[PDB]
């Protein structure tokens, strides 16, 4: 029996998941505090938020957290970096062993720790034997020379150290850090999607994350500096209300498509928290639609830069992917197939007791942290 605690640190919500080997033993989402635009700006609040999630997970389990932690976070600074490692055995041929591959990968990882960056994910991209033979798997093959191309997802050391130091002071356990955007993709994509080509659009809070896979590995990673925070801001601005009332309206009555909406008055509070004001579901959706249209139009540039290096279409993830009919809007903007990403619609076996979270695009990274 083996247990995993997976935490996904977002700017608006911190998601937690305990899995046992498959079943879900515990899961929760708590308000994220102290993170402002991917930077920890209040370590005291941040630690409180994390502790609140840990306490809720323990409360559900009725047992102290004894597992390996895998913890993911979002940053605009993740980027793709490649390197090649070679072995030259001389005038004799040698078997390519696990020890040799382990050694070469360890060496790649050490090589990617440079220019102020550090790798969080590494993938073997190409294998070349004896300077001419391309193979899919080098193991047990004999060769005089081997060259392996690796592609990785790296992050600035300063960003890494920020999260690592605070977490090791709060999570009382060994842990590994990952990219939430990479884990999201790993949590939702099918193998054929990752092979033939597919783009994940993660509709997160501060920004919209963008990652493309082809041939089983990430080929491009970027972002648009517009996210659900700006959708909430627009509503607060237009309806003249608080951030939290705006968020309530969007979650409760929002739609990505407004043209066919029935007349429907909806009430909300002013900044004073008492004055009752009224708008319509249609007007609310127009405000949302416009900002969502902006997000997708801007993401199209990425889509086109990838469209040079898309069978699998677009997979939307993150909190924004839950806005009713957003897939319709996306299909119209991207001019390609679009689907909602969640663990359940990946190509993997159902998980006991995961009904509520396996179908939630918000928990994609939490699952992906584990099933990588």
């Amino acid at each position: 029996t083996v247990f995993y605690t997976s935490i996904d640190i977002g700017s608006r919500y911190i998601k937690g998941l305990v899995l046992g080997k498959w079943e879900a033993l515990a899961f929760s989402s708590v308000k994220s505090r102290g993170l402002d635009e991917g930077e920890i700006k209040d370590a005291i609040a941040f630690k409180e938020s994390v502790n609140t999630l840990l306490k809720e997970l323990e409360e559900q389990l009725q047992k102290s957290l004894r597992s390996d932690f895998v913890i993911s976070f979002s940053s605009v600074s993740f980027e793709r970096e490649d390197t090649v490692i070679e072995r030259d055995f001389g005038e004799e041929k040698r078997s390519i062993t696990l020890d040799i591959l382990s050694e070469m990968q360890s060496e790649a990882l050490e090589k990617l720790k440079e220019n102020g960056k550090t790798p969080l994910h590494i993938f073997s991209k190409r294998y070349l034997l004896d300077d001419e033979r391309i193979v899919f798997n080098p193991l047990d093959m004999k060769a005089s020379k081997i060259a392996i191309e690796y592609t990785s997802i790296v992050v600035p050391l300063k960003v890494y150290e920020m999260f690592y130091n605070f977490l090791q002071d709060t999570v009382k356990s060994p842990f590994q850090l990952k990219s939430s955007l990479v884990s999201t993709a790993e949590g939702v994509l099918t193998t054929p999607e990752k092979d033939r080509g597919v783009v994940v659009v993660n509709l997160g809070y501060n920004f919209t994350g963008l990652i493309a896979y082809k041939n089983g590995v990430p080929i491009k990673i970027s972002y648009v500096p517009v996210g659900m925070k700006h959708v909430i801001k627009d509503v607060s601005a237009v309806l003249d209300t608080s951030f939290e009332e705006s968020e309530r309206l969007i979650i409760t009555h929002g739609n990505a498509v407004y043209n066919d909406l029935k007349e429907e008055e909806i009430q909300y509070r002013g900044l004073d928290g008492n004055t009752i004001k009224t708008t319509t579901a249609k007007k609310l959706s127009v405000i949302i639609h416009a900002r969502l249209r902006e997000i997708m139009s801007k993401s199209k540039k990425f889509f086109r830069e990838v469209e040079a290096k898309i069978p699998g279409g677009v997979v939307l993830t993150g909190g924004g992917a839950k806005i009713p009919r957003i897939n319709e809007l996306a299909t119209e903007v991207f001019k390609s197939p679009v689907r909602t990403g969640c663990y359940a619609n990946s190509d993997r076996p159902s998980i006991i007791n995961a009904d509520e979270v396996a179908n939630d695009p918000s928990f994609a990274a939490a699952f992906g942290n584990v099933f990588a």
Partner: peptide, 14 residues
């Protein structure tokens, strides 16, 4: 920042 609704000229629906 100007809300997208204005920048997309959909404010007539408000």
């Amino acid at each position: 920042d100007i809300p997208a609704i204005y920048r997309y000229g959909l404010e007539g629906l408000l």
